[PDB]
Amino acid sequence: SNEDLPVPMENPYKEPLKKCILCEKHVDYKNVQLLSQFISPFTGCIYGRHITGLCGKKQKEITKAIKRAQILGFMPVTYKDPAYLKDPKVCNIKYRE
Amino acid sequence: PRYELALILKAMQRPETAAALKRTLEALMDRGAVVRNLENLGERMLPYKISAHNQRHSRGGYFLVDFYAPATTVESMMEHLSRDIDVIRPNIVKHPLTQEVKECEGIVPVPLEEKLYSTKKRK
Amino acid sequence: SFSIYPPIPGQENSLRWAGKKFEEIPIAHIKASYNNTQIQVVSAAHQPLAHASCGTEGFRNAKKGTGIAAQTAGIAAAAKATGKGVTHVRVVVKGLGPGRLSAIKGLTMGGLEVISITDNTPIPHNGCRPRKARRL
Amino acid sequence: ANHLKFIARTVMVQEGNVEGAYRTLNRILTMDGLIEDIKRRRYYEKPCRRRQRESYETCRRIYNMEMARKINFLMRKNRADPWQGC
Amino acid sequence: VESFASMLRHSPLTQMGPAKNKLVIGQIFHIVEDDLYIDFGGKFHCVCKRPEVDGEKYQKGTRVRLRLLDLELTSRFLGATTDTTILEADAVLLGLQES
Amino acid sequence: QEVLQLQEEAKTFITRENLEARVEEALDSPKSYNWAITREGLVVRPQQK
RNA sequence: AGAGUUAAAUUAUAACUAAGCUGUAAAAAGCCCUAGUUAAAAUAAAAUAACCCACGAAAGUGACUCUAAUAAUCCUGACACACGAUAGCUAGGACCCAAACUGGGAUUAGAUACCCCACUAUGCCUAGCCCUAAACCCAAAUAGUUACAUAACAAAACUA
Ligand SMILES: [Mg+2]
Ligand SMILES: [Mg+2]
Ligand SMILES: [Mg+2]
Ligand SMILES: [Mg+2]
Ligand SMILES: [Mg+2]
Ligand SMILES: [Mg+2]
Ligand SMILES: [Mg+2]
Ligand SMILES: [Mg+2]
Ligand SMILES: [Mg+2]
Ligand SMILES: [Mg+2]
Ligand SMILES: [Mg+2]
Ligand SMILES: [Mg+2]
Ligand SMILES: [Mg+2]
Ligand SMILES: [Mg+2]
Ligand SMILES: [Mg+2]
Ligand SMILES: [Mg+2]
Ligand SMILES: [Mg+2]
Ligand SMILES: [Mg+2]
Ligand SMILES: [Mg+2]
Ligand SMILES: [Mg+2]
Ligand SMILES: [Mg+2]
Ligand SMILES: [Mg+2]
Ligand SMILES: [Mg+2]
Ligand SMILES: [Mg+2]
Ligand SMILES: [Mg+2]
Ligand SMILES: [Mg+2]
Ligand SMILES: [Mg+2]
Ligand SMILES: [Mg+2]
Ligand SMILES: [Mg+2]
Ligand SMILES: [Mg+2]
Ligand SMILES: [Mg+2]
Ligand SMILES: [Mg+2]
Ligand SMILES: [Zn+2]
């Protein structure tokens, strides 16, 4: 009969979950600009999660997409297409200090 | 749409181009295919130089053919594309729009793993 | 935004050295192998203008490994090249060995002017299997 | 080899200082893991002997990550102490 | 008589809710040269560094404005049973008891 | 609903005749998929021409 | 499991150019039908992504595409049935590179080894065998519990 006790409700102050930069985006092997965004400019490397900062599924998605874009040849392997070097940079790498 | 055809074609003038595309979709419509659409992605300088049919190409035209086809067929069309003298590289992919978008709800944060090692009062 | 390194093969970039396009500037191949170094300075037209090896410079089986030898070969190479009148050089290092840096410096100190370094070191994407490791 | 040349792994020296630009390129390759790969690939390394490497590396990376965090968390309390000689 | 549960339900520490980005009022009870030890009343004091603006204005007994980051500093670490306490809370300095 | 979607696209399909049209149109209107991203999740599509 | 495809690297083989090139702790032998550069199929192997931890019963599986496709309304179960890494065997292809064997070269008291250099069975494919591993996560399967409780060490203790 104690009406001042606590309630067994869920947490109202719960913070909304964070989102990969692509969460519910659509990764296609067709936009090479997008895939260029996640590749090292000098190498043609594919950045890891710890750089790109993507969900699991979106990393995997991006990777496969890239490889497809390479064999089908919309995108080259060993360097970032120069056209796209001047575009917005997503990743956390600092090369030049 | 079911299947997708990435056509990289030898860069030509317009008439020859038209010819090539036309006969391509003819071949497909003959193997039993229903063509949805034709998307010209332009003539680009290829990311790298591609050697096929004893010609090493720098540039190429890019095309996208969405179509429905029966399972048995895809091999046939691939063969007839590989045979072709002006295709600078063929491919056929399950059309991207069959694949579902299952909502990233977000990052499910992973907590540090506990109860790996036994409790021991060592040192 | 000054000195973005990779100048495009399109003509949108006008930057001239000795009034030449970046495409026309001479390529100095440097090959640094653990036992050796060799430089070959070649025209944009691919006509070799200079060649110097650590051995051609009169070092011998071990000693020719060192960076000393590298800069040594570099100097005389840039001598032979300067003789045919090349001001500027875009350099490429092949392999990873002792005389990488030494030889590159060797071209400068040897009186040859350097614009670019690019590294082409063959990196197998898992092609041919290497020889076995050693002690075993 | 089929790709356009001189676009890849290329730095262009600025204000004529060579040594600086070389350091730069080196920092590139070593940032991407190519130096560790060249050096790795001078000789072969057998698959088993490779997963051992992988696992030792990854354990060690976990340890160092954690220990780093702990250090930078306890950093505050490096501050000179209030209560001395109580 | 008040039941404890009632005292809890109506307290400010409850009313505040989550600790992040709260605007709190606090008091300086101890000083080492650059460092000012601030009880905002929560459980543990936080620590601060005396700002460049009006250095000598912040003294023992002074009251202060705080942006409360975390009610206390804690985490679990590799191969730990219990998490590790700093015995402080994380806060930032805004202005001094702006009146 | 599905069946009616397809019923709608059946008017837009490429058939033996429209080849002559479609192909001539495909060359006329190049289309891009090229598409980008911003750190806020925002997209910037290609700049207006 | 099929069928199709190739980006990096390497090699034939030409064009130039220089006499060396390779190789170690240091050398020697070895090769100059060598080396650097520029071209370039086949064969073989699949950087980064992976700080991921998925798929398979296990062995195993991480270049690309398409086809086929992952038993059981789900308890245990063999000497029965079907599979089973490497190496090996049989027949036919393949041969870039690696490489037991072997022949040179050093080292050494000796050196049948560790280091160097060539080159072979063999790794590769198709078909058939062989059925072994530190085949080990040395931790049986299926339901449970965190009660009771520290031989030692390791991956904490136990029911049915
Ligand atoms: Mg312990
Ligand atoms: Mg690998
Ligand atoms: Mg052994
Ligand atoms: Mg070549
Ligand atoms: Mg790694
Ligand atoms: Mg087969
Ligand atoms: Mg090749
Ligand atoms: Mg070659
Ligand atoms: Mg060759
Ligand atoms: Mg040595
Ligand atoms: Mg000799
Ligand atoms: Mg790895
Ligand atoms: Mg694994
Ligand atoms: Mg099943
Ligand atoms: Mg059973
Ligand atoms: Mg077997
Ligand atoms: Mg076998
Ligand atoms: Mg053989
Ligand atoms: Mg052969
Ligand atoms: Mg051999
Ligand atoms: Mg012998
Ligand atoms: Mg002895
Ligand atoms: Mg020894
Ligand atoms: Mg041989
Ligand atoms: Mg095998
Ligand atoms: Mg095993
Ligand atoms: Mg084991
Ligand atoms: Mg056993
Ligand atoms: Mg059993
Ligand atoms: Mg079972
Ligand atoms: Mg129990
Ligand atoms: Mg004891
Ligand atoms: Zn996401």
DSSP conformation letters of B7-73: EEE----HHHHHHHHHHHHHHHHHHT-EEEEEEEEEEEEEEEEEEETTEEEEEEEEEEEEEE--GGG
Q: Which residues of F touch A (CB under 8 A)?
A: 33-39, 41, 44
CB distance B95 to B40 below 8 Å:
no
Query: Rounded to whole angstroms, how far apart are CA atoms C113 and E20?
Result: 58
The experimental method is cryo-EM
Residue numbers in C 35-94, CB below 7 Å of strand G: 35-36, 38, 40, 42, 46-48, 51, 53-56, 60-65, 94
DSSP letter, residue F14? B
Phi and psi for B75 in degrees, rounded to 5?
-55, -50
> Taking Cα atoms as reference points, which of E94, E95, E88 lies closest to residue E30?
E88
Beta-carbon pairs below 8 A across chains A and F: 34
Rounded to whole angstroms, the distance from the CA of residue D48 to the C1' of nucleotide G60 is 14
Q: Please tell me whether any atom of strand G lies within 7 Å of the Cβ of C121.
A: no
**Where do the DSSP E strands lie in chain E?**
22-31, 35-39, 46-49, 63-70, 74-75, 84-85, 90-93
Q: Please tell me whether any atom of strand G lies within 7 Å of the Cβ of C125.
A: yes
Compute and round to an integer the Cα radius of gyration of chain C: 16
Domain extent for C96: 1-136
User: What CATH number has the domain bearing residue C55?
Assistant: 3.30.420.80
Q: Given its phi and psi angles, is residue C3 left (phi above 0), alpha (psi -120 to 50 degrees) or beta?
A: left
Phi and psi for D22 in degrees, rounded to 5?
-65, -45
Total domain count, chain A: 1
> Taking Cα atoms as reference points, which of C97, C93, C89 lies closest to residue C113?
C89
Total domain count, chain C: 1
**Resolution of the structure, angstroms:** 3.6
| CA B38 distance to own-chain centroid | 14
Q: Which residues of E touch B (CB under 8 A)?
A: 76-81
Q: Facing residues of C39 across strands?
A: C30, C52
* Helical spans, DSSP H, in A14-74: 32-37, 49-52, 56-71
**Domains of chain B, start order:** 1-123 (3.30.70.60)
Q: Please tell me whether any atom of strand G lies within 7 Å of the Cβ of C127.
A: yes
Q: Please tell me whether any atom of strand G lies within 7 Å of the Cβ of A55.
A: no
Query: Rounded to whole angstroms, how far apart are CA atoms E51 and C38?
Result: 61
Alpha carbon of C51 to those of B27, C60, F32: distances in Å? 57, 17, 49
Angstroms from F42 CA to nearest CA on chain A: 9
A97 interfacial to chain E (CB closer than 8 Å): no
Name the residue in chain D with its Cα closest to that of E90.
D76
